[PDB]
Amino acid sequence: KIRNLPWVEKYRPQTLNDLISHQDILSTIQKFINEDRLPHLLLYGPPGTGKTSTILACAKQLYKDKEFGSMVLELNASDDRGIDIIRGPILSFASTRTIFKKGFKLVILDEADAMTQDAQNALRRVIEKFTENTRFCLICNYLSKIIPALQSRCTRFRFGPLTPELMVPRLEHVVEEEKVDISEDGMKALVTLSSGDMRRALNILQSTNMAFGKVTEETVYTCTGHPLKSDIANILDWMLNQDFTTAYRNITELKTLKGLALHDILTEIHLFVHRVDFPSSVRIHLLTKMADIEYRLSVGTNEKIQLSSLIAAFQVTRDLIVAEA
Amino acid sequence: HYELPWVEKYRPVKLNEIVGNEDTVSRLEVFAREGNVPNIIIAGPPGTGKTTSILCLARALLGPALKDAMLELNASNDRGIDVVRNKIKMFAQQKVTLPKGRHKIIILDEADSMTDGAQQALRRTMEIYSKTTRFALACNASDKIIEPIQSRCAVLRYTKLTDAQILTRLMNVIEKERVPYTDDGLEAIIFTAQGDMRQALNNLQSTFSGFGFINSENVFKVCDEPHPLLVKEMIQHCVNANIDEAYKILAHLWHLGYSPEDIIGNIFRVCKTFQMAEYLKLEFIKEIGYTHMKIAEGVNSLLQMAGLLARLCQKTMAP
Amino acid sequence: MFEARLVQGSILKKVLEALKDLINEACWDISSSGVNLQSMDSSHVSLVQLTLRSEGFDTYRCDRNLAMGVNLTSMSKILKCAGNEDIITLRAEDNADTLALVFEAPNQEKVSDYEMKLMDLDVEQLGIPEQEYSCVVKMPSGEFARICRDLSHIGDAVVISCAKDGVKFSASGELGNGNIKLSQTSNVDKEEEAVTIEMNEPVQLTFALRYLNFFTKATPLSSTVTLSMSADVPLVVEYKIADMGHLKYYLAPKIEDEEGS
Amino acid sequence: MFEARLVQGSILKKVLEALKDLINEACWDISSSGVNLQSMDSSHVSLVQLTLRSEGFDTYRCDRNLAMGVNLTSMSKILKCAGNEDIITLRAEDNADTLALVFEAPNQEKVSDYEMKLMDLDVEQLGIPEQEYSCVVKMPSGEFARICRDLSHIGDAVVISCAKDGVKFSASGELGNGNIKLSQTSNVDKEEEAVTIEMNEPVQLTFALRYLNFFTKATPLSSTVTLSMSADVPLVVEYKIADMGHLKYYLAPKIEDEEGS
Amino acid sequence: MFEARLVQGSILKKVLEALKDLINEACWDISSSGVNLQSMDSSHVSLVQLTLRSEGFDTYRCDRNLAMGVNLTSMSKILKCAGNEDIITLRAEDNADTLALVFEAPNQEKVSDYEMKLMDLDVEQLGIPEQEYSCVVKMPSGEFARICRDLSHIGDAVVISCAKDGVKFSASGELGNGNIKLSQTSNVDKEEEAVTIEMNEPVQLTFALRYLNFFTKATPLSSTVTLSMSADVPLVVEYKIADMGHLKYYLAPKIEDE
Amino acid sequence: ASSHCLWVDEFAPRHYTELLSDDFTNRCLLKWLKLWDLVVFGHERPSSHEQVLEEMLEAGLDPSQRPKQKVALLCGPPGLGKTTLAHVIARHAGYSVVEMNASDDRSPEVFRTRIEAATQMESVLGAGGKPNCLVIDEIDGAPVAAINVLLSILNRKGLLMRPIICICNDQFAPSLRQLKQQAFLLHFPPTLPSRLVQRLQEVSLRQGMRADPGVLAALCEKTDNDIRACINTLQFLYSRGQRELSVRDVQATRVGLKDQRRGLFSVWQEVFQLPRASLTSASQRFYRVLHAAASAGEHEKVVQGLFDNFLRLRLRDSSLGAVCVALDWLAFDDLLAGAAHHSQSFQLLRYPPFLPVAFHVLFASSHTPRITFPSSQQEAQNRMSQ
DNA sequence: TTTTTTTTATGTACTCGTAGTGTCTGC
DNA sequence: GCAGACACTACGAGTACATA
Ligand SMILES: Nc1ncnc2c1ncn2[C@@H]1O[C@H](COP(=O)(O)OP(=O)(O)OP(O)(O)=S)[C@@H](O)[C@H]1O
Ligand SMILES: Nc1ncnc2c1ncn2[C@@H]1O[C@H](COP(=O)(O)OP(=O)(O)OP(O)(O)=S)[C@@H](O)[C@H]1O
Ligand SMILES: Nc1ncnc2c1ncn2[C@@H]1O[C@H](COP(=O)(O)OP(=O)(O)OP(O)(O)=S)[C@@H](O)[C@H]1O
Ligand SMILES: [Mg+2]
Ligand SMILES: [Mg+2]
Ligand SMILES: [Mg+2]
CATH class of the missing domain: 1.10.8.60 (Helicase, Ruva Protein; domain 3)
Incomplete structure (x- = not known):
């Protein structure tokens, strides 16, 4: 049947074979599942890499549809996850048995970076004491927001970029x-x-x-x-080859015709500066200047003045580069 | 029955199986043999074995009287101003018959989460009933425990585990588990662990479960190289005003998927203990905080981190 | 179209005051046989099954089956303002979200239409095993509620044991041990007070006290509660309403570890 | 010079906790016929009239017409130390700026006096028109306490209509509406439960929820509550405090918002 | 092995709510003569002496001398599940940390076995309080509890002065003054209501109110209360129970007399 | 029962002659308790900070035959014997000790009834009964209303007839401001190393083991003049495996080292003054200043003290570059506080601990600066609110 | 050898006081 | 049968702090 869903949720890897990138990590996780020795997992990485989908495929593979409510306690940042929850429902779920069929339970804690330090400190002995009955999976994007005791208790798999x-x-x-x-x-x-x-x-x-x-x-x-790569190359060519008014007119004409934004231009120019064989002082000055312009665009500022400063950051170093010889 | 992971299956049950901090563990073994242990606070890094040492000492001291003469409290319990007044105090006055040299042991694991008022209320019940009961506290950051509690104990401090101390227990777990291995893979396991025995056992079990053999590239396929060891070299490259190698390491850490918050936090921790001039370190820390303000307000890209690296290179060339 | 009608409103009051602090949302499963409700608690430890017969209603019609997710915190504030000798009307359209809770005041004059808003929580159907229990015990609900309150004073989790002689309640708490053993007390004038043993295999399991006292709030529903127990399958606290249906409870045992010594 | 004696101490223990959260001052006006209290809030939304006649006091001596103002913060702490069935006597001199309040026992050697500073407030009487309303109905006091607490769980603003069938209480919110229409309960044993309608023009208006719920803790002061309202005249809630006088309340209509897309 | 089978659970019920907030502990001294409780407040204010002999129980077995340091609040949750007319088996082992109480309280066969963890306190010794009391009277218990509640309405302390006509109770406060004069009420049909005067050297002392009212909490337990007081010697109320034993209390007076 | 007790309890003082505190404080507490005999025992005869205490002891009596100081406040760092001296002095003067601690409920009603029970009636034993001495340990942890209840029962003109001893760990708590204007203020100096080393020698000799006094002096300097910490550390390090203590065991940080809550004035002194002359490395001073300034706590008060004290020094930077970069650092701290309290990102609070080490690097001098308490910002805020 | 005070804007956690309220006792 | 007393939990309120 046809469904009205976004394509990031209509096409979700319900099994572990449908994920693409982290083949060694998923092979190790499948060998953990097949040998009935799944430990406390710590799935961390950049967004969109498939950390939620991995543990959802694991929970679907481990437990059938007739017993999924008795085995998975999934809590994320949308639910309240205070220390009352850790000392209450999570502890009672961890310290009790299963209603229907005998087996080990799973507590999935999505967005574990958003949990408080009190709840994370209260989570340590719930993980350590009841490790035979239940397993805890922590999924986060920032590993610095998880206390080192929870990082020690859970083996970590870095879900890197695809x-x-x-x-x-x-x-x-x-x-x-x-x-x-x-x-x-x-x-x-x-x-x-x-x-x-x-x-x-x-x-x-x-x-x-x-x-x-x-x-x-x-x-x-x-x-x-x-912007396309050719237009960024043209913008760099104009900033490194011609004078201020002509390069300003060319870049302003390109930005008016294409409807470009200065953030993507700054990102692609920052990527093209490290490829271009610049001197060290010129590269340091250029990096500081584009950091200043990209910081300046985060408030109610005029974009034309920042574009003029972006041209200025290369017109300063044109003479230095040429006299370097 | 379900098989336990190697972290909790191979927990030491006696005090002689605990490696690292040999003098403190030997004195705890002597106390466990004889008796009359004092109040004890063990502090150290995670995974060192403070909970293991406290539980092994309590198990060896008490024995068959474990279920009635030991009160274990954790952060998963309450331990508020009411639990100290009605539960620690009532157990302290409670009469339990015991052999000579043996006392009731109140184990307060993770005492950093204990509030200041509860630790203030813990003092007089600790001093009055010391003829009958004893206390054993475990903590990570010893500064959270208040000074009158630390004066009431022999504050033991655990150091990070030496690679040979991890290596001996790695031999133990390998020969009871029959794990094929090479030497370089076990050095990779030790390098990934970084003084954490929990991480060593977790990485060894993950490498054995995923591949069945311990070489270097089997370890590094599922585990990772530690992050601040590259940050130290990149901060060193920023010290000699070498922006190219510093950006190479920064881009390598960026393509590995590390968030800017984690990168700038490990930059600050490396620059905290780095060996340079004091004023240069202070202006480096000021620049790191100024960049972290921009990271916290919302703008966090590779351009901001490269600008931070360029400003750190500028701080050396600007006396 | 769904139009159920409670013959007295006190039956609905005693049901939803037992699930007020226990269950998260009311998922009414509607069919021609009757009104069903099979939802776990918030902690995924306890399970509540409620089946009300269509013959107990005043008039009951159901053209098509519905799944009816209704939040209970907003629901339980309407049975506070409900009479006990009164008429309760439940209405639901085919493709709407309003839930008319029409009743009368204790002053007994006025219609009182209260509306709910349906929720879209999909839930996988939890399969009740319906297996034989190795300990079946009939016991009054008032006596089962009293000794659950007395055991909450002493401990945190209670050891419940059944055998040939009778049920046995043990609470290893802070102040000491509290042991209550009751048997064969059917030699009374009342028929509700009776302790009867049906099966043979002796089991021992530990349960949380905070859910056993939660289950005993259905004391005005039934005079006698059936206790079903075995080694693997959980404890059942079974209330059978006299002319409405049955209320079925489940509670998983706790994890206990023997000392190594 | 003002000195008055009360029959019961529970009258001030039922009238003065009601205005704990409405008005910021207690202005008592002395006349030969009795006392008068006309005060407003800081929001200018509710007006309270309290008139107790002189014939019901144990003693009453009055010579001049003055105006004294009493604060609430010190007064509310005093009455918790006072009794319930005792006699409450008051004293205020002509030139003294300190009202004396005594809550002694009816058979006691000594008195207990907790005096407070008289606040010199400059207020004027707005003047109620006392015009003919659109509907005047009588309602029970204790039932009005339940139905004001009834709609507090639904929304923040309620709608009171009063047609020829009865007085309609409505509360529309994000949860669901609730409609209550008291009517025609003259066939009862008590004379308190007789709900009658006297007049006929129907008026629909919206009134704020909080100020009605601030009123209905003074319900055991009287037996019945008379409700009077019109199209543009504010809603009048009438209390009759035994034989010593009467109490009147006033609510301006709550401002209804716009409707958009 | 120690066993004490109290014939009614009402008498051991009515002991403990009298001494609930009064003492933080119970020290049952176990001997062949009976049970003994010489407990003492930590602020040296009130003393509780309780002795019930062996013949007043259903049975009594004792091997050697024993002491039961018992938490009093921890006991109080047992008697909330106890009954009024039932048999109570207060038992303990010789060298053990437990104290069991076996009963059939709801009269529905329900054998309840409630155990209590013992606690150890320091062995303080109060041998014999001296009894050279100048003023002794006997009073009804139910009248004594009502006048203690009457003076609790207004004041916070009672000035108690003995006299040949009777014991005079006085109290003062900001609300008022509560005062009554006791007269000779021996001309009644009830023998418990009669006041007997066998005193000399009248004295006038001041006592606290929060400690006097809980002395009169066990007034349905015994019909007659014997008041004993004198100069520089604490007040004694005495609850002579019918068959199993007796209960007496002690109360230090206030420093500020009258 | 040698194996059944702690060494702090076995070697605890029971008489007056075996106390280890400063002698003055002992004389002052004994003389304060011995003048109470006129009202309590009914007997006329009992048998700088120095000058104020000696004047106030002989200041006379008010017309109630009771002292003008109704409680005594005992302040100092933990581990000297304040509770021990209070109990020994109370048991020496014929009193009976009534212990108040932080393990009680300490609600104002409970506080009121317990003080009224302890102090306002005599003994139940009658003649020969010892009077009741109220000892209130850890009064600094009590709430404000408990101290208000104590001052209300202090000033009843129901008069107080029994002495009360209050023991605290910090006199500068906001709940003990009024108490210090009414109490017999006894300040505890740290214990002398000679008496401490001799007492540790007696403790080690009574256990039959040898420790030379160099390693005992090292333990005394490591544990901060603490009897309880040193005796517990000796109990852990001795055991029964060996008899002779090694210097390297005490000099190791693995046992007996505790984090010390440094005072504000000690932190300002260590920031503005260089240590007198290994320990000459600048990185060690950097880490020491940073760790102790972080361990002191109350970071805003440290920032205010550094702001109010860095312009009063004998500054060698005549070009005002150090003052300009110190103000830059202070503005950096203020910006960090605003950014942490605005964006709800509290991970920016790891850098304002580096403000005192920046002031220590900038203004390291060998002089003796007179550091005053900060008050300009508080008086400016009060005046602005006014 | 030196000690007062409420601002920063949320989120959460702790602790304590208070108020309806179900239930038990008694004439 | 109805008034008074008991403990019970829910709720309002004040305060502290958040990093290595
Ligand atoms: N490895 C992958 N293989 C296939 N599709 C993927 C993969 N990773 C992400 N997707 C797609 O992206 C969608 C979102 O993936 P998620 O698992 O939600 O990402 P995520 O790892 O949870 O990142 P965050 O930190 O939670 S935002 C999935 O529903 C898939 O459609
Ligand atoms: N010194 C050690 N010798 C042997 N095994 C150890 C040692 N330290 C840790 N382990 C292993 O690691 C597991 C966890 O050790 P723990 O004692 O829980 O660590 P920890 O010192 O308590 O750190 P925290 O603060 O609790 S996270 C044990 O069950 C052992 O299997
Ligand atoms: N002269 C002494 N010789 C040996 N041990 C002593 C001596 N004086 C005191 N002690 C012990 O050292 C401790 C003295 O500290 P305490 O008086 O109990 O508490 P404190 O010194 O007031 O510090 P705090 O703030 O309460 S932790 C006790 O354990 C005493 O047994
Ligand atoms: Mg996700
Ligand atoms: Mg641990
Ligand atoms: Mg002390």
């Missing part, structure tokens, strides 16, 4: 099941603008399929609003 080589076939499966016409440069633009995140890749694909009907590099860079 590389674009293994990220292609999942997008191909979504395209084939969604009947989407896509070119090679469109898939390249998806796996480039996503930057290790399969959620925003599917969001970009759905938004481009709704906006244009086709997925090409032009359509993706128009729907997202990102």
Whole structure:
């Protein structure tokens, strides 16, 4: 049947085989499940890498549909997770048995970085004392927000960013099941603008399929609003080659015609500075200047003045680079 | 029955199986043999074995009178102003027959979560009933425990585990578990553990369950290299105003998926104990805090971290 | 269309004051046979099954089956303002979200239409095993509620043991041990007060006290409560309402560890 | 010079906790006919009229017409130390700026006097029009206490209508509406439960929930409560305090918001 | 092995609510003559002496001399589940940390075995309080509890002065003054209501109110109360019980006399 | 029962002659308790900070034959014997000790009835009964209303007829401000190392083991003049395996080291003054200043003291660069406090602990600065509110 | 050899006082 | 049968602090 869902939730890896990237971690987790020795897990990494979907596939594989409510106590940041919950429902779930079928339970704590330090300190002996009856999985994005005792109690698996080589076939499966016409440069633009995140890749694909009907590099860079690599190279060429008024006129004409934003321009220029063989002092000055401009754009500021400062940060170092020789 | 993980299955049951801090563990073994132990606070890093030492000492001292002459309280319990007044005090006055040299043991694990008023109320019940009962506290940060409680005990302090001390128990677990291995893989396990025996056992069990053999690349496929060991070298590169290698390490840590908050926190911890000038360290810490303000308000990209690295390189060349 | 009608409103009051501090939301399962309610508590430890027969209602019609998720904290504030000798009406349309709770005041004049808003919590159907129990005990609900209150004074978790002679209640608490053993007290004038043993295998299990006293709030529902117990399957506190149906409870045992010594 | 004696001490233990949270001052006006209290809030939403006649006092001596103001903060702490069935005597001199309050036992050698500073307040009488309303109905006091607490669990603003069938209490919120229409209960043993309608023009208006719930803790002062309201005249709630006088309340209508998309 | 089978659970019920807030502990001294409780407040204010002999129980067995340091609040949750007309088996082992109480309280076969963890206190010794009392009278118990509640309404301390006509009770407060004069009430049909005067050297002392009212909490337990007081010697109320034993109390007066 | 007791309880003082406190404090407490005999025992005859205490002892009596100081407040660091001296002095003067602690409920009604029970009636034993001496340990942990109840029962003009001894660990608590204007203020100096080393020698000799006095002096300097910590540390280090204590065992940090809550004035003195002359390395001074300033607590008061005291020194920076960067550091702390209290990101509070070590690096001098308490910011805020 | 006070804007945790309220006792 | 007394839990209120 057809369903009205976003593509980041319609296409969810219900099994561990449908996830793409972290093959060694998932093989170790499947060997933990198959040998009935699953320990307390600590799944951490950047967003969109598949940490919630991994433990949901684990809970679906471990327990059937007729007994899922008796085995999984899933608590996230949307629910109240105070020390009353740790000393109350979580402790009573951990210290008791199962109603229907004999087996070990699972307490999934999504967004464990948002838990308070009192609840995390109260969670230590609940994990340690009842490790035979239940297992605790903590999923976080920031490992610095988890106390070192909880990091010691749970073995950690770093769910790193999804590389674009293994990220292609999942997008191909979504395209084939969604009947989407896509070119090679469109898939390249998806796996480039996503930057290790399969959620925003599917969001970009759905938004481009709704906006244009086709997925090409032009359509993706128009729907997202990102500047293309050639235009960033042209902006760098104008800032490094011509005088202030002509480069200002060229960059302002390009930004008016394409409707570009200065944040993406600053990001791509910062990426192109480290590739360009600059001197160390020039690179240090440029990095400090673009850090100042990108900080300045976080408030109610005029974007034209910041664009003039972005040109100025290269017009300062043009003479230094040339006289360096 | 379900098989326990190697952290809790291979918990030491006697005081001679605990490695690390040999003098303190030997004195605890002597106390467990003879008796009349004083009030004890054990402080140290996580995974050192403070709970293991306290429970082994209590099990060896009490024995068959364990279920009635030992009161164990944790952070999962309340331990408020009412629990100290009606539960610690009533158990302290409670009459339990015991052999000579043996006392009731009140184990207060994770005493940092104990409030200040409860620790103030804990003092007089600790001093009055010391003829009949004894106290055993375990903590990570000893500064959270108040000074009158620390004056009432022999505050023992545990150090981080030496690699040979982890290696001996790694031999023990390997020969009872029949784990094939190489030497370099076990050095990789020790390197990933970093003084944490829980992390050593967890990483050894993960590598044995996922691959069945312990070499270096089998360990590093599922475990990770520790983060501040690269941050130390990148801060060292920032000291000599070398922005290229510092950005190389920063981009390597960025492509590994580390959030800017974790990176800047480990930068601050490395710069806390780094070996440079004092004024240079102070302006480095001020620059780190100024960047962390921008991280906290909402803007957190690779450009901000590169700007922080460039400002740290600027601080050296600006006397 | 769904139109149920409680013959007295005191039956609904005693049901939902027992699940007020226990269950999270009321998931009414509606069919032609009757009104069902099978939802766990917040801690996923206890399970409540409630089945009300259609023959006990005044008039009951149900054209199509519905799943009826209703928040109970907002629901339990309406049975406070409900009479006990009074008429309770429950209405639900085919594709709407309003839930008309129409009744009368204790002054007994006025219609009082109160509305609820339905929730969309999908829930997987929890399979009741319906297996034979190795200890079946009939016991009055007033006596079962009294010794659960006395055992909450002494300890935190109670050891409940059943055998050939009778049930036995033990509470290893802070102040000491509290042991109550009752048997064969059917030699009285009343028929509600009776202790009867049906099966043979002797079990021993430890349960949390905070849920056993929660289950005994259904004392005005039934004069006699059936206690079902075995080694693997949990404890059952079974209330059978006289002309409405039955109220079925489950409570998982606690994890205990023997000393190594 | 003002000196008065009460028959019961529970009258001030039932009238003065009601205005614990309405008004910031207690202005008593002395006349030969009796005492008068007309005060407003800081929000200018509720007006309270308290008139106790001189014929019911044990003694009453009055010579001049003055105006004294009493604060609430020190007064509320005093009455918790006072008795319930005792006699309460008051004293106030012509030139002294300190009202004396005595709550002695009816058979006691010594008195207990907790005096307070007289607040010199400059207020004026707005003047109630005492015009003919649109509906005047009589209601029980204790039942009015329950129905004001009834709608407090639904929303923050309630709607009171009064047509020829009865007086309609409505409370619309995010949970669900609740409609209550008291009518035609003259066939009872007590004369208290007789709900009658005297007039006829129907008026629909919206009144704030909190000030009615601040009123209904003074319900055992009287037997019945008379409710009077009109289209633009504020709602009048009438109390008759035994044989010593009467009490009148006033609520302006709550301001209804707009409706948008 | 120690066993004490009290024939009614009402008499051991009515002991403890009299001494609930009064003493923080109970020290049952176990001997062949009977039970003994020489308990003492930590502020040296009131003393409780309780002795019930062996013949007043259903049975009594004692091997050697024993002492029961017992938490009093921890006992009080047992008697809340006890009955009024039932048999109470107060038992303990010789060298053990427990004290069991076996009864059938709800009269529905319900064998309740409630154990109590003993506590150890220091062995303080109060041998014999001296009894050279100048003023002794006998009073009804139910009248004594009512006048102690009457003076608790107004004042916070009672000035008690003995006299040949009777014992005079006085109290003062900001609300008023409570005072009554005791007269000779021996001309009644009830023998417990009669006041007997066998005193000399009248004295006038001041006593606290929060300690006097809980002395009169056990007034249904015994019909007659014997008041004993003198100069520089604490007041004694005495509850002579019918068959199993006797109860007496002690109360130090206030420093500020009259 | 040698194996049934702690060494602090076995070697506890029972007589007056075996106390280890300062002798003055003992004389002052004994003379304060011995003048109470006129009202309690009914007998006329009993048988700088120095000058104020000696004047106030012989200050006379008010017209109630009772002292003008109705309680005695005993202040000092933990581990000297304040409770021990109070109990020994109370048992020496014929009194009976009534102990108040933090393990009681300490609600105002409970406090009121317990003081009224302890102090306002005599003994039940009658003649020969010892009078009741109320000892209130840990009065600094009591709430404000409990101290108000104590001052209400102190000033009844129902007069107080029995002495009360109050023991606290910090006199500068806000709940004990009024008490200090009414009490016999006894300040406890830290114990002398010679008597402490001799008492540790007696303790070690009574247990039949040898420790030379160099390692005992090292233990005394490590445990901060603490009898209880040193005796517990000796009990752990001796055991029965060996008899001779090694210097390297005490010099090791694995046993007997406790975190010490440093005072504000000690922190300001260690920041503004260099240690007198190994320990000459600047990194060790950096870590020591940072750790002790973090361990002191009350960071805002430290910031206010550094703001109010850094301009009164003999500054060698005539170009005002150090003053400018110190004000930059103070503005950095203020910006961090605003950013932590605005964005709800409290992980920015790890850097304002580095403000006192920045002031120590900038203004390290070998002089003796006169550090006063900060009050300009508080009086400015009060005046602005006014 | 030196000691007062409420501002920062939420979120959470702790502790304590108070107030309806179910239930038990008694004439 | 109804008035008084007992403990019970829910709720309002004040205060502290949040980092390594
Ligand atoms: N490894 C993956 N393989 C396939 N699809 C993936 C993968 N990771 C993410 N997705 C897709 O992205 C969606 C969201 O993934 P999530 O598991 O919710 O990400 P996440 O790891 O939970 O990140 P955070 O920290 O919770 S925002 C999934 O429903 C999939 O459609
Ligand atoms: N010194 C040790 N020798 C042997 N095994 C150890 C040692 N320390 C830790 N372990 C192992 O690690 C497990 C956990 O040790 P714990 O004693 O719980 O650590 P910890 O010192 O209590 O740290 P925290 O503060 O509780 S997180 C034990 O069950 C052992 O299996
Ligand atoms: N002269 C002494 N010789 C040996 N031990 C002593 C001596 N004087 C005191 N002690 C012990 O040292 C401790 C004295 O401290 P206490 O008086 O109990 O408490 P305190 O010194 O007031 O400090 P705090 O604030 O209460 S922790 C007790 O354990 C005494 O037994
Ligand atoms: Mg997720
Ligand atoms: Mg531990
Ligand atoms: Mg002390």
